[model samples]
Target: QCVKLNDGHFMPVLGFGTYAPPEVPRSKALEVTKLAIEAGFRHIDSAHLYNNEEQVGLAIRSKIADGSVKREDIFYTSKLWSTFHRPELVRPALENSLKKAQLDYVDLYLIHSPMSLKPIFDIVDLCTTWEAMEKCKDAGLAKSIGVSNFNRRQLEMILNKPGLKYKPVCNQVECHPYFNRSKLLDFCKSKDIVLVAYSALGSQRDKRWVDPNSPVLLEDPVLCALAKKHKRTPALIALRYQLQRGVVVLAKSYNEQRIRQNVQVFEFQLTAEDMKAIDGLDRNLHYFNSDSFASHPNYPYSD
Candidate 1:
C-alpha cells in the first residue's frame, strides 16, 4: 500500500527505519539494510545524523544494479538536520543528503524537527527553508517536501503563509498505540496530509524517557495475548495497528529475522476488536524526548 503524496509520488505504507545505535558498526548496518531489501521492504528511512548513509547507499545501489529492485520501486526518504535549518543552508543540506545517498532525488524530504535555535526563530526563516525545498523539487533534487515533529498549531502557521504554492505532504511524528495522537491525526486527515509515524512499536525502552519500572509496550497483556492468538510477534501487531489506523509506519530493526517479521504484518489483518484492545493499552507514553529543545522559547513539542 502506497500513500500518494500531494506532489503525486507514492510512499510505501511501511518503511524500514535505520536509526541504529552509534556504536553499531557500518558493516552491520549495510548487512541489515541488504537483508531488509531482500525481505521485500520497498521503503527505507535514513538520515545524515545516522552516520551510515554511505553504507545504506551502497546496499541500495547494489540491489538496484542486480535487478533486485528498481530505483523507483523503493521510496527513499531522508531528513534535514537542525544545523542546516538556516535559509542559506537548506539547499546545501539537501545536496549533502543526495551526495550521501548517491541518489539523484529523494521521494520525500522532511524538516527533522520544529524547534529552531533562538537566533533562527523567525517564521520567515522557516518559510525560506520551505521555499528552498520547493526549489529542490524544481531542480529535481527531491520529489516532495514535508515536516517532522510539527504540531497542528505550527503546521497551521506554515499553511497560512502567504504565496505558499506547496502544501506539506505529511507530518512525521512519534506515533504508536502508546501515544496514539488522535487529535493530531484528525487534523492532518482534515488537511489531507499524510501522517507518518515513527516509534510505531513504542520507543525501544530508552531509559531516558521510559521509566525502568514501566511496563514495556511489547509486553502489554493485550498485545501479548493477540500475538499468542495469531501466532505473530507483538511487534507485528503494533505495526499493523498503526497501518489500520491510516498512518504510515516506520519499523526499525537491524536483525534479519526481525526485519523480515516487520514487513510481514501486511500478510494478516487485525480485527476491530483487536485494534480496540490495543488502543486500550495507551498510557500516553513517549520515548524520544528532545530535552535540549524543550527549553526553547518557541518550543512546540511540549504536551
Candidate 2:
C-alpha cells in the first residue's frame, strides 16, 4: 500500500531503510536493496551521510537494467547533512547526492536534522534551509522536499515562514511501540502531513547513538507477548502497529529471512482489542541518543 503525500505524489507505506551502510560490506547495500526490490519494496530510504549512495544507486541501476522496475516506479529519499546546512550548499548537497546515486533526481529530499548549526548558532536557521530545499524542488532535482527530526514548534516555524513556498510533506522520526509519537502524529495528521517512522522494529544495533544500557525494542516483553498472541514476530507487531495507525514505517533488517518475513506485515489483521492493547505499550523509549548532541541549541527531544 502507498500513502498520499501532501504534494499529491504517493509513496509506499512500507519502506526498506538503508542505514549503517559503512558498518557492513560496501556491496551490502546493493545486495540488500536488490533483495528488497525483488521482495516488492518500491520505496528506499537513504541519506548522503550514509556514504553508500553509490551502492544504493548500483542496486537501483541493476534492477532497472534487468527490466524488473523502472526509475519512475521507485521512490528514493536522501537527506542534507549538517555540514551542508548552508542555504547555498543545500542545492549543491542535493546535487551531490544525486551524482552519487547516479540518478537524475530523487523522489524526495529532506533536512536530516534540525541541529545543523549544532549549538554553534552562527547564522543557522531551519526556515532558511527549508527555503533552499524548496528551491531544489523548483530546480527539478527533487520531486518533493521535507524535514526530519523537527519538533512541532519547529514544524510551525517552517509552516509560518514568511512567504513559505511549500510545507513539509512528511516528518521522519524514530517511532515504535516504545515511542509511539501519538501526540506528534496527531499534530502532523491535522496538517495533512505524513509521519514516516524509522526504528519501527527496533534499534538498528548501531552503538553510536544508542545507549548501551537500553533494552532492545524487539525484546520488550509487552511487544513479544503481542507477537505470540498474534502469531507473528515482535518486529511485525511493531511495524504493523504503526501502519495500522496511519504512519508510514521503515523496516531495517539485512537478514533475508527476516526481511521477507517483515513483508508479511501487509498480510495480517489486528483486532481493535489487539490495537488497544498494543497502543498502551508506549514507554517513550528512544533508541537513538547522541551525547554529542546533548547541548545542541536545537536538540529535538525535550529534557
Candidate 3:
C-alpha cells in the first residue's frame, strides 16, 4: 500500500533505506541495493551525504535495463544537504544529485535539514527554499518537494509562505517505537502530510547516536512477548505497528534475511489493541539527538 502525498504522488508504505554501515566499501551499496530490489523493495531512500548515490543509481539502472523493474515502479527519494540552503546554490545542489544518480528527475527531493553552520544569507529562508523546490517540480527536476528534520513550526512557516503553490507532502523524522512522535505525526496527518519514520526499530546498535545504556527495542519484554504471541519476530512486530498506524516506514539492512523479513509487514495485520500495546512502549527517547542543531540560535528543528 502506498500513501498519497499532498502533491498527489504515491509512495510505497515500506522502503529500503540505504544508510550503509560505515567502513563498508561502495561496492556493497550496489550489491545490496540490487538485492533489495530483487527482494521486493520498490522504494529506495538515499542521500548525497551517504556518499553512495553513484552505486545506488547503478543498481537501479541495472535492474531497469535487465527488465527487473521499471523506473516508474520505484520511488527514489534524495535530499539536499544543509550547506546548499542558499537559493542560488539550491539548483546546483539538486543538479548534483541528478548527476550522481544518473537520472533525469527524482521522484521526491527534500531539504535534508534546517540547521546550517553558516548563516543563510541571500536565500529566501526556509519558505523561500521550499518555493525554489516547487520550481524544481515545475521544471521537471523533481516530482515532489518536501523537507526533512523539520519541526511543526518550520512546516507551518512553509505552508504560510506567500505564493506557495504546493504544500509539503511529508516530514521525514527519526521516529521509532521508543521515540514515537505521536503529537508530530498526528499534526502532519491532519495537514495532509505523510509522516515517514526513519528509525522504526530503535537505534539500539547504532553506537554513533544510541547510548550504551539505552533500552534495546527489539529485546524489550513487551514487544518480545507480543511477537511470541503472534509467532513473529520482534522486528516484524515493530515494523507492523508503524504500518498499521498509517505511517511510511524505512527498514534498512544489508542482510538478505533481515531485508526479506522487513517487507513481510504486508503479510500480517496488527489489531487496534495491538497498536495500543505498541504505543504504550514509548519512552520519549530520541536516537538521532541533533543537539548541535537544537542549540542553534535560529534552529528550525526545535521540537
Candidate 4:
C-alpha cells in the first residue's frame, strides 16, 4: 500500500529499514538492501548516522541499472544527525547525505532526534531546526522534511510555530506490540501527520543502544499464535498489525532470507480479533537507550 504525502509524492506504506552498528561491514547492508529491492520493496528507510549511506546508494543504483526499478520509483528516507543541529548546518548536512548517497534529492529528510545538540549557554529551538529543513525542501534538495524521536509536545511546538510554513509529514519512532504509542500516534493522526514505525519486529539489538533485557517482539506469545493461525511468521503479523492500524512500518533485516520473506505481509489479512489481541499485548514499553540525552530540555521520554 502507498500513502499519499502532502507534497504530492506517494510513499510505500511498508519498507526496508536499514541501519548497522559500527562493527558491521558496509557491504553487508549493501547486499541486503539490493536483496530488499529485488524483493519489490520500493521504500528504503536509512539515515546518515548509520554510516551505510554509500552502500545504500550503491544498492539503489544497481537496482536501477538492472532495469528492475527507476530512481523516481523508490521512496528514500534519510535523517539529520543531532551533531549537525545548528540551523546553518542543516541544509549542508542534508547536502552531505545526498552527496554520499549520490542522489539529487531525498524523498524525505528528518531531524535525527529532538534533543538540542550541545546547546551550550543558549538553547537551540527545534522549530528553528525545522525552518532549516523547510528551506531545504523549498530549494528542491528534499521532497519532504520531518523529525524522528519527537514527542507530542515537541510536534505541537512546530505546528504552532508563529510563522510556520510547512507541517512535518511524518514522525519516525520506535513502535511495536510492546510500545503502541497510542497517545502520540493519535495526536499525530489528528494533525494529518503519518506515524512511521521503526523497530516493528523488536529492538535493533545493538547493545550500545538497546537495553539488554528488552523482549524480542517477534517472540511474543500472542503474535506467535496468531502467526501460526494465519500460516505466516510472527514478523509478518507485527508488520500487518501496524499497517492495519494505519501506521507505516519498516522491516529491518540484513539477512537475505528474511529480506525476501518479510514482504509477504501484504499477501494475507489479519482478523479483527487477532488485531485486537495484538493491541491487548501492549505494555507501554520503550527500550531505546537515550540516557545520553536525558538532561536536555527537548529530551522527549522524561517522566
lDDT for each residue of candidate 2 in 33-95, tens digit (9 for 90 to 100): 999999988899999878889999889999999999999989999999887787988999998
Task: Give residue 155's lDDT in candidate 2 (0 to 100).
Answer: 92
TM-scores for all predictions: 0.94, 0.96, 0.94, 0.96
Candidates' C-alpha lDDT: 0.83, 0.87, 0.83, 0.88
Any runs in candidate 2 off by more than 4 Å, and if so which? 118-123
Model 1 lDDT on a 0 to 1 scale? 0.83
Q: Candidate 4, residue 228: CA error in Å?
A: 0.7
- Candidate 4 scores a C-alpha RMSD against the true structure in Å of 1.5
Pairs clashing within candidate 1: none
Residue range with the least summed lDDT across 10 consecutive positions in model 2: 116-125
Q: Over 4 Å off in model 4, which ranges? A: 119-122
Off by over 4 Å in 3: 119-124, 298-301
Candidate 2 differs from the real structure by a C-alpha RMSD in angstroms, to one decimal, of 1.6
Clashing residue pairs in candidate 4 are: none
Task: Please give, for residues 76-177, the per-residue lDDT of candidate 3 as tens digits.
Answer: 999988777777677888899989989998898988887654533223377767777888889989898888888888888888888889987888888888
- 237 Cα displacement, candidate 4 (Å): 0.5
Runs with alpha carbons beyond 4 Å of true place in candidate 1: 118-124, 207-213
Compared with the true structure, the alpha-carbon lDDT of candidate 3 equals 0.83
